[PDB]
Amino acid sequence: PGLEDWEDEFDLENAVLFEVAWEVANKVGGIYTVLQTKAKVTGDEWGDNYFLVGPYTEQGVRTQVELLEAPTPALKRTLDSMNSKGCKVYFGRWLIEGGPLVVLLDVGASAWALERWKGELWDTCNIGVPWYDREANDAVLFGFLTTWFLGEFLAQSEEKPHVVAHFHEWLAGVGLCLCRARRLPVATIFTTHATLLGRYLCAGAVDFYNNLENFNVDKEAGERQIYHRYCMERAAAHCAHVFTTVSQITAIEAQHLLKRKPDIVTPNGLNVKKFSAFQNLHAQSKARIQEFVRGHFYGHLDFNLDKTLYFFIAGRYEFSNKGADVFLEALARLNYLLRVNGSEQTVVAFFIMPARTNNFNVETLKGQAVRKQLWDTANTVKEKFGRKLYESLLVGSLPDMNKMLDKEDFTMMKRAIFATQRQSFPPVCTHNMLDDSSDPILTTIRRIGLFNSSADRVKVIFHPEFLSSTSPLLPVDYEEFVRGCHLGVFPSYYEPWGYTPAECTVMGIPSISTNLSGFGCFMEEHIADPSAYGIYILDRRFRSLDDSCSQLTSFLYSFCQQSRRQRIIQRNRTERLSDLLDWKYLGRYYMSARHMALSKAFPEHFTYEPNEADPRPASV
Amino acid sequence: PGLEDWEDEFDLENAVLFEVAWEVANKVGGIYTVLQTKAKVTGDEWGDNYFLVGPYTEQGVRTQVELLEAPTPALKRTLDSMNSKGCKVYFGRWLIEGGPLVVLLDVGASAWALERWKGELWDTCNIGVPWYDREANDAVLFGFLTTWFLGEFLAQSEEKPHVVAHFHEWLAGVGLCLCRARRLPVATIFTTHATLLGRYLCAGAVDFYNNLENFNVDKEAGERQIYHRYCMERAAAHCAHVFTTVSQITAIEAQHLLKRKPDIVTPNGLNVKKFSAFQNLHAQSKARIQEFVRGHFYGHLDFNLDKTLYFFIAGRYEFSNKGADVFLEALARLNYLLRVNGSEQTVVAFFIMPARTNNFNVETLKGQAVRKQLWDTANTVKEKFGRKLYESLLVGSLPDMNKMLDKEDFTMMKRAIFATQRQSFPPVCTHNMLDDSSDPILTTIRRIGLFNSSADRVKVIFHPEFLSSTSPLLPVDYEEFVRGCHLGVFPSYYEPWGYTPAECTVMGIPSISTNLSGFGCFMEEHIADPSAYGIYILDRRFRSLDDSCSQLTSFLYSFCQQSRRQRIIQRNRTERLSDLLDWKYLGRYYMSARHMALSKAFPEHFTYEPNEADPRPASVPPS
Amino acid sequence: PGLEDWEDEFDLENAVLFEVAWEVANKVGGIYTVLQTKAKVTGDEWGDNYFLVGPYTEQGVRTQVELLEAPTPALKRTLDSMNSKGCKVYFGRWLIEGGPLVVLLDVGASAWALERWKGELWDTCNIGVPWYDREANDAVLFGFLTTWFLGEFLAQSEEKPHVVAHFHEWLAGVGLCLCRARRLPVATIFTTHATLLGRYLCAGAVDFYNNLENFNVDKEAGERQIYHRYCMERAAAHCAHVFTTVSQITAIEAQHLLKRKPDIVTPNGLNVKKFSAFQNLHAQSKARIQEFVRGHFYGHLDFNLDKTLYFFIAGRYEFSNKGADVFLEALARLNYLLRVNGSEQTVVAFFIMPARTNNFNVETLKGQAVRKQLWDTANTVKEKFGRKLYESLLVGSLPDMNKMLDKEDFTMMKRAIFATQRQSFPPVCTHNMLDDSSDPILTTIRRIGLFNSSADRVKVIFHPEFLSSTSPLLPVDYEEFVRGCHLGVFPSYYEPWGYTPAECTVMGIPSISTNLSGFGCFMEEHIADPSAYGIYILDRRFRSLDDSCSQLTSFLYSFCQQSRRQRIIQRNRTERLSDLLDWKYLGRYYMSARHMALSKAFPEHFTYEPNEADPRPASVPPS
């Protein structure tokens, strides 16, 4: 279909791309996966003129970096000069699927220059850094080292090429600022994955999205003691040839806080081939989830398990940002609706959000052991009965059904039956809270009245620990457990890009997102009638909290009212949607941004035609 | 072969057997398994005249007891009378493989009688019980209740049968004492599974087995504040028609401390059919143990794993009683011998003894993760290479071997090789000690110098936690792990009967025991040349500590010097040895003891012929 | 969705249904499966008032009939009377999923009445039967026996119920004719599964469907010496309260040859639950078909197997009726188109049509053996390489790729490469023809030029024998092999109802049918834009032969030009189509027909509202 070599045929000639980022070969957050996945297509486009510049860490170097020798004489001269001038620079390959060249700069070996460099910055942009930050100073050192490397690389080159530099956060924006200060012949791009003030303002300050025009960013930046970081990010965004954000909602947020509209929006992608390695995996995972809920709810298995539906929400334990409270309120409302209308449906909701626990509680392990004992006893009696049936049927006689069971069988089954006696109700949490009084999820569960009662049509299971294949009572990793659920609910409030909903959608699982997140906006823009494809977009930007809860309840109830055929058709449509999130399609925006930067910095040699052409027409 | 109905054809007629024990339907220790396993053959012999009398516990009743109603009018009358006289008695069926009838007595519902009953005992045997014991008072209540039940059962019977009562410890000996006091028409048997003073004297007092004739049992019993318990046990043993012990060494110990030679010795048995459900299982378990030691010793896999031998010792964390110190010293000596003689053998020893830990350490999990990563990478590259080879071979061309590996393969293998880098040596313990300074095993390991060095020919792994199938890094239970080891070393010092060595032998694993344990004495008595069958008996009774360590080192070195064929033949001989430990053969001694009791109590109706008749020696004789 | 209890709420009261057919408990053809599958829903609707009347055969009775006694006194009286009057009648259960009551009549025990009954028929309808038919006489005896049974059942009934009789062919039409002759109080239905003259006229006579109005059925019936059978069928159809056919094309054919338009059309259905037990099964079956074509085409595997498509046609070896010649011509045209346009696609077509063979030929077995040898050698070398890689990677060293292969590996691979040498081209037939000169499929293959050449983009494999799981070289049954194919081509010319295309569609496989068959007409009527759902209907009724071949070539080329995503979407739409062919929906037409018969025969007690309501508009293919 639409591949990289579609219409962007550009005269790259002698051009060098430097992918500057603080998080290459050094796992910290989420852009690490972005760069690691994008390296393959970037190297396919640029060949060997692609370098990733990052800080030097011992752990990362010994784990995933293979040190080599500089392949070009100019690079070797640059490395030798910088190493002899009082620095420490390493070169190698990043042991990832693309195998790109990596330049690693040790910021701990250049403290002596800090007192000088900190002055020079002030003599250039009137930006000062407090001595006690301990994280911005690393950014200053990294930026000065990157500018030094770029200048030396341009000086040592026999024929000077057109250099394109791409900085990825405020941690790397000082290098861009200094590149523009020294008037180096480079083309600068700046990408923001989340505006700095956004996460500060979402928590504490009220109505962040309804006061984007009433925010005096100087005041909030200064009062929170992050004024220098805000100035760094805004200066980096201001003096860049091309400015970019990873989502539309981030584009509005940056246009109102960084005072610059992005020239282009480049969404985050991923490699879908590895995820694709969908009904066989779904069936197996659903069977295992059925076994787990059989074990957990032992002694209370009075509801049909062929009419039960498995919802889930996953991610970091952010109660408001991940929208767990809205999910809980909607679950209570859906429980009331299911009880009132006299339905046979049951809904088991899972909350996989890490918290501060110690171990499992006794009830959960007890239930798993009870289920294992019953399964073993049933298999033993079944095998014995099958052998007896075969033997009695080989002689041409109908089995006397009142003698296939004997004394030890009845003993085993009586012990098994005695095992499943319980007077209490299943717990809503599978672990032991260290802060059970101050936990918000459990507090809301208690407030709204979901105690896994027999009359309740909605059961809730809160599983703090991450899902691991070696766990005693969920011996399965995250992906295979998710493949067996029916729906994923991510009603995010503050979310520049949703990695978890995108991963869920790639696996072929219907999902609920919002228009306050990057993934939700992307899917809303690229699909007509997304609900037919299994994506439910919750209008959370133009609605109140109660209206959002009501709409979520409507979505959940309408999902519960589908037939099995409708659910199958919806899940097939969701499955045929993964190619929209691959770097084979989402990597074209990066190409367009680089072309814009090249044409802006060197208009004599390059010219750009603003082709912004880049899908799912169905129903509506 | 030799079954129950071999020569003991006895006129059982109207006889009732009561198997009195404190530990029926109530799991506490090890005789629970003895009674649970023996119930099947006992019920086959006695039919429905077999009752197990024990205390009433809520947990046991709700877990494994099915309450029923009395099947005979006499039993119903007895139960109703006792329940209306101020007691609480339950009747039921024990949910085990035999399914025997159980009479459960609630000792907490008869505290009001204690002040009376405690007096009556003194008016009968001059035995007092201090009020602060809290465990002997339960024994007194249980004994009085059992005597009450037996008396009422005899009173309510229309035709009086011959009752045989079998008491199993000092906790149940008060009932026997009171049965003999009231001159009831019953035949009493007393079985001791361990003499009370033995475990007290083994720890603290020196040379327990070399001073059995120099012990003034009254003094040691009194000084340890267990004089009343000692008097209870000795009185129960004294006034019994038949006295029994579970082993020969226990027989000498009881003859010298209880002042009565046992009339018979009844060893403990087990059901071998369940254990038999052993070369395929051994191969699979050995492969998994190889994988575990590959993971643990990552970055130091410089020794041949086809020449490595897996020893182990298991049981409760008793450093001296289980003989771990002798094992450690012998391991150090064997390490010196293996290094000096320039051998290619390696010995990995396992110490599975529970201790007080919290979690695994980082190194062990790191090694398991490294092994998993290497296995996954190798399988990925292998599958890719196999697909490419098949494709290139279907077109009739030899594979160009320099192009089957491409960039992402080399990336995966380089990452794995980077992962397998380590500068330190593997740990000797897989957990985090809470008392690492005061641990005796680790202290001795440090003292003798076994740090899993590269030059060391003996590696040591101490795994405190019990082996469980759900463990993160040993996902295997005890039986299936043990089935893959080469030898089990149990040089026990004080051990009335060895359940772990017997279980190991039933599975077909060669083992080392001593003549200071019941299992070792049994195997020494029943086998000629036990070492040919894979049982090495250590002479620990007539030797010093250093001589025992030297003999153990000799045994280990001689085992290490066998060829593979010799080891296979030895393990095959060990496999044909499980039927010696089954209740189908070991249940005949109980029958003989019951016959002796019946003939002693009622000589008019029964007479006993002292037939103490009860195949091994060698196979193919080389010399 | 639409179940049986939807809108036909009818007052059955006391009514008895008799499902008369010559083929109950006696497997002959295809209506056996129809009755066996329909019995479940029919019994659910009618309970125990449902009887199947059929001939008595020893094999069927001993295999699938369980003899019982009459459950009602009237039935017992009827059976006793008929058995004492000179007949032989059996009663029992049919051992099928519904378990319906079966009445079996022995036509061989009533030859004495033939000379009488044959006369009586002439005294009623002026129909004579030649003595040498030997199949119509059985029909006459069966019809007279069925009428006798119905009359006796009505005579012996204490309260007379409303009896509904359903006859299913000309073999059972004499009973209906005699029921109407004797004016019995019964409601008759007649179902025709194929008109008798149709199969005679399709072969030999030209342009059968373009001369339906120019056929003097008396002349063709008389000239073919089947005049008596034709008169039997036409008389049965004429004097029936309700007349039915199994398809629309059969409805026109009967309206023009039997001179009576059907009152209703009842299509054949099946139980889809058993077939459903679709991508995992498809993937596995496609892998096995890939392995088979790898074995067959050894030494010529120069084409991409990830771009090959598997077509097939199955059924009885009727060259013209099953439309094999059109398929072959379209295959040749598609081969020319694929070669001219320089495509990378390959098409392997399968012809599974039984013929008269002896055994496999040498080349096919040779290829299977070669493939097995290559697979074994590759697996051996792969396992050895994986073990060496793991061992060399556990020590932290990159594998020296030039030493992972040694002498015996190269020996095995050289032997395999020598084994894969061939100079000739793969055969088009997997067996040894006994009539290779007179075979039409091979003659047409030779004429059109499909010799499995290297340049040919269409390979052809003709496999006469039925697919069996125990075959040496296709060890798989029909269903699993079909599940792996991409398309099924059934361009039938004469086909009253297509069991094979319907079975293929139930499994979820896109198919090509025609409007000259019952299944094709049904799917055309019930679906809007069937090609979006994977059903390609070929206009063969209003087109010539060459136009049909051109349209089939267009269909095949358009299928070959789809992307993988389009093929996946089409196959999903085909999968969501099986519920249209189930008896849960197709059983309602039988209910409507029975209601019409009851209302026509007994208008006083029953009345029928002519409700003929019984739909797949495309999902989202933007139009």
Author numbering:
A (entry chain A): 13 to 289, 293 to 629, 637 to 642
B (entry chain B), C (entry chain C): 13 to 289, 293 to 629, 637 to 645
Sentences from the paper on this structure:
Glycogen synthase (GYS1) is the central enzyme in muscle glycogen biosynthesis. GYS1 activity is inhibited by phosphorylation of its amino (N) and carboxyl (C) termini, which is relieved by allosteric activation of glucose-6-phosphate (Glc6P). We present cryo-EM structures at 3.0–4.0 Å resolution of phosphorylated human GYS1, in complex with a minimal interacting region of glycogenin, in the inhibited, activated and catalytically competent states. Each GYS1 monomer consisted of two Rossmann domains and a tetramerization domain and interacted with GYG1 in a 1:1 ratio.
The cryo-EM map ranged from 2.9 Å resolution at the core to 3.9 Å resolution at the periphery of the complex, allowing for modelling of residues 13–289, 293–629 and 637–645 of GYS1 and residues 317–349 of GYG1. The complex adopted a rectangular box shape, with residues 317–349 of GYG1 at each corner of the GYS1 homotetramer. The as-purified GYS1 was highly phosphorylated, representative of the T state and supported by the lack of GT activity without Glc6P. In the T state, the N and C termini from each subunit traversed from and toward the two regulatory α24 helices at the dimeric (C–D and A–B) interfaces, respectively. Overall, our model suggests that the nonsymmetric interactions of a single phosphorylated site (3a) at the dimeric (C–D and A–B) interfaces, combined with intersubunit interactions of phosphorylated sites 2 and 2a across the interface, stabilize GYS1 in the inhibited state.
